[PDB]
Design a protein around this ligand. Sequence first.
Ligand SMILES: C[C@H](CS)C(=O)Nc1cccc(-c2nn[nH]n2)c1
Ligand SMILES: [Zn+2]
Ligand SMILES: [Zn+2]
Length: 231
Amino acid sequence: EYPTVSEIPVGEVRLYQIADGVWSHIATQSFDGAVYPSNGLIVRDGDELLLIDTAWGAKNTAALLAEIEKQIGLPVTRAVSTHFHDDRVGGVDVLRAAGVATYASPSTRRLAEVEGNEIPTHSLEGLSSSGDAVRFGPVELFYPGAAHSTDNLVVYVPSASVLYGGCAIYELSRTSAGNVADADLAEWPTSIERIQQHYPEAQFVIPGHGLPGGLDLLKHTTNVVKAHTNR
Ligand SMILES: C[C@H](CS)C(=O)Nc1cccc(-c2nn[nH]n2)c1
Ligand SMILES: [Zn+2]
Ligand SMILES: [Zn+2]
């Protein structure tokens, strides 16, 4: 079964096989007095692994690398962070120290700088305007426009029809807004339709926090954002 928050002590990471050569990584971390689960992606890139997002902190991210080595045994050589928050860049310094080349859009890297979070080393060019998409090894990176954050990217794995929505996408059982401190509640439903229009063939949809689902997560997320807009 997909691991839930009460099953993962903070400091431990679980790996979950989604398809051949595609895994999600699941960690847990405290935020303002409660502990939450968090998802990331791992994609086989030939003889190497491409990591999508840290495990939300340095200690969790070290546990992630240890779990990858134990269970998969290929090197993580590249990583992309999908937004500037700590569940996506927190641990980038651990990755860099372990030899991982770290990437994020230029908007993400500057927003990370400002918030005092860790900063990916390399900039992803070609994602500066909503609707833009670029190839990055075995994945496509898509900028859907502002949503959970103004700099949020989603990640598509064509080999497997896996759509990684990151924190722009809510899981089914979440019916209220999470951290919207940095969100653009007006644009958000528009960006979701863009995702829907760019990846209608998506088979698995992974939110930034919680249980994977289908393209139904897109509709559901839009409802939650709008419910919260006239609450
Ligand atoms: C740092 C990380 C960036 S998305 C984060 O805020 N995760 C996160 C995840 C799930 C819920 C909440 C939340 N906030 N208020 N009620 N629930 C926050
Ligand atoms: Zn976030
Ligand atoms: Zn998040």
